[PDB]
Amino acid sequence: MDYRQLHRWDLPPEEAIKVQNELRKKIKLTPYEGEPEYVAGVDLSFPGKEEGLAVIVVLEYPSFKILEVVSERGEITFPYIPGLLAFRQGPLFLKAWEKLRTKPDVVVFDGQGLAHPRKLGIASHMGLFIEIPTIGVAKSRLYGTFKMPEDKRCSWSYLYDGEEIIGCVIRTKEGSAPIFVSPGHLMDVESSKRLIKAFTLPGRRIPEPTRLAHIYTQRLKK
Ligand SMILES: [Mg+2]
Ligand SMILES: [Mg+2]
114's enclosing H/E stretch is: none
Angle at 195 between CA 175 and CA 140, to 5 degrees: 45
169, 175, 177, 216: which is closest to 197 by C-alpha? 169
* Residue 157 CA, distance from chain mean position: 19
Cβ neighbours of residue 34 under 8 Å, at least 6 residues apart? Answer: none
- SS3 (DSSP) at 62: coil
The ligand placed nearest to the CA atom of residue 212 is: 2
Tell how far the Cα of 139 is from the centroid of ligand 1, in angstroms.
Answer: 9
DSSP class of residue 45 equals E
- Write down the experimental method used for this entry: X-ray
Tell how far the Cα of 119 is from the centroid of ligand 2, in angstroms.
Answer: 23
Can you list the domains of the chain with their CATH numbers?
A: 1-222 (3.30.2170.10)
- SS3 (DSSP) at 161: strand
- Given a contact cutoff of 8 angstroms between Cβ atoms, the answer to whether 32 and 193 are in contact is no
- Given a contact cutoff of 8 angstroms between Cβ atoms, the answer to whether 214 and 40 are in contact is no
At residue 35, φ and ψ (nearest 5 deg) are -100, 140
Angle at 145 between CA 137 and CA 24, to 5 degrees: 60
Cα–Cα distance for residue pair 166/184, rounded to 1 Å: 10
193's enclosing H/E stretch is: helix 189-199
Please, what sign has the CA dihedral across residues 142, 143, 145, 151?
negative
Q: List 17's β-bridge partners, or say none.
A: none
Query: Residue type for 174, please?
Result: E
117's enclosing H/E stretch is: none
Could you give the strand order of the β-sheet that contains 52-60, starting from the edge strand earlier in sequence? 66-74, 52-60, 38-45, 106-110, 134-138, 179-183, 164-170, 156-161
CB 34: neighbour CB atoms within 10 A? 8
Q: Which residues are annotated as a binding site for Mg(2+)?
A: 43, 110
Q: Resolution of the experimental model in angstroms, please?
A: 1.9
Cα–Cα distance for residue pair 120/116, rounded to 1 Å: 6
Tell how far the Cα of 44 is from the centroid of ligand 2, in angstroms.
Answer: 7
Cβ neighbours of residue 41 under 8 Å, at least 6 residues apart? Answer: 56, 57, 59, 107, 108, 207, 208, 209, 210, 211, 212, 213
The ligand placed nearest to the CA atom of residue 142 is: 1
At residue 151, φ and ψ (nearest 5 deg) are -80, 0
179's enclosing H/E stretch is: strand 179-183
The ligand placed nearest to the CA atom of residue 57 is: 2
Tell how far the Cα of 158 is from the centroid of ligand 1, in angstroms.
Answer: 22
